[PDB]
Design an enzyme around this catalytic site. Sequence first.
Site, PDB file in Angstrom:
ATOM      1  CG  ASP A 150      -1.557   1.347   1.627  1.00  0.00           C
ATOM      2  OD1 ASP A 150      -1.955   2.116   0.714  1.00  0.00           O
ATOM      3  OD2 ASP A 150      -1.637   1.639   2.841  1.00  0.00           O
TER       4      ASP A 150
ATOM      5  CE  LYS B 296      -1.544   7.317  -3.583  1.00  0.00           C
ATOM      6  NZ  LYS B 296      -1.903   6.294  -2.563  1.00  0.00           N
TER       7      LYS B 296
ATOM      8  CD  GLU C  98      -4.684   3.827  -2.645  1.00  0.00           C
ATOM      9  OE1 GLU C  98      -5.424   4.659  -2.077  1.00  0.00           O
ATOM     10  OE2 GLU C  98      -3.556   4.116  -3.103  1.00  0.00           O
TER      11      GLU C  98
ATOM     12  CG  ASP D 245      -8.934   5.476   1.998  1.00  0.00           C
ATOM     13  OD1 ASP D 245      -8.409   5.530   3.136  1.00  0.00           O
ATOM     14  OD2 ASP D 245      -8.270   5.364   0.930  1.00  0.00           O
TER      15      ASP D 245
END
Length: 385
Positions: free
Chosen positions: A10, A71, A175, A199
């Site tokens: 992850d 990211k 994800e 999330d």
Amino acid sequence: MAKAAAIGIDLGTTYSCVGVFQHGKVEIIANDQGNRTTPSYVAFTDTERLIGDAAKNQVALNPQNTVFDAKRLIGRKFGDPVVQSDMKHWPFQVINDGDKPKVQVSYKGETKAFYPEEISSMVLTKMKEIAEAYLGYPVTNAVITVPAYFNDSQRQATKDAGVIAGLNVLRIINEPTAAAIAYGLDRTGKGERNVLIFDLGGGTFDVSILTIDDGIFEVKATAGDTHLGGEDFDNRLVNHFVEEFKRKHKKDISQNKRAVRRLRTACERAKRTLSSSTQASLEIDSLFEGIDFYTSITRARFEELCSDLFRSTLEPVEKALRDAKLDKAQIHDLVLVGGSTRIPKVQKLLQDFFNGRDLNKSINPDEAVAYGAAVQAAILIKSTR
Ligand SMILES: Nc1ncnc2c1nc(Cl)n2[C@@H]1O[C@H](CO)[C@@H](O)[C@H]1O
């Protein structure tokens, strides 16, 4: 041996996690400091390159040469309004190399510039070495996760980070799909299953709606706030304690960078305590001008301080439901992802929005994505033989 082994990674915005499926169970692998998650930070110093916890721990003393949020840049063009907007908030330099962003730093006394994929590959190399130290042999096959809204260019740059890091990337998976795999939501037999993944991480909030029709996954909707997470809750606590210090001592600490940072780290710790206790204590020796800051806060006061932020998480949930053309009662499963979903008020708000529904939260929410990726990596490596 090593060729029949595969890991699940992850690769997160603020934290990364690595898992391995062996002997019928997932093992989330602890780093050398015993932490099951590692900060996605890379520090460049006068003598070395630091990755993870050691990089995050010296961020205060070296902010210009400590890279994070790679990211947010990966697979993007320099001219992209997301890149241009984010650059205004980072203490490190971002430069343009043929419409591609590079992070520019000082390393061992020399100016060096890195592509976001080279930064992410250093985080991936650390996750690979954490797995190798746990297993006793090098593992090179990996499943790497990305947000469901990542386009082809962001997915390709993530795979490239994997190649640079020395990993054989079996697959780039979403994800929310890894999270649904972690709960075995693709093994309920026949008939379309609607899953909502909530999330809430350190710096981002994502809501995903998936349909699982006979093992096949389909993303129906994605919604959220790219600039909402756990760090906004820490900052609300910081503002409260700065005003409380001002009421007790008639002194403004807001300009003292060291005082604000020590208070911020203590607030983050107190916030985590408030997820399992109804009060938390701050114990900061000599916070400002030799004055100790020994205080406490209830969960009730913390919930008041963050009330508007917690409630704002329900607008992207409604938005995702309308885009997916689904009503609340049409959602079969609710999955929690990200460390901030441990906050009891967040869980109560989501459960009341879904009319008292049970939530899938038995897997450590900051580990569920790596858990699912590890499961997929084992299935994929077994089929490869
Ligand atoms: N017990 C907790 N109660 C509240 N917030 C938590 C908790 N654990 C983590 Cl991690 N976070 C936060 O999750 C993010 C990483 O996923 C960070 O913002 C961290 O503070």
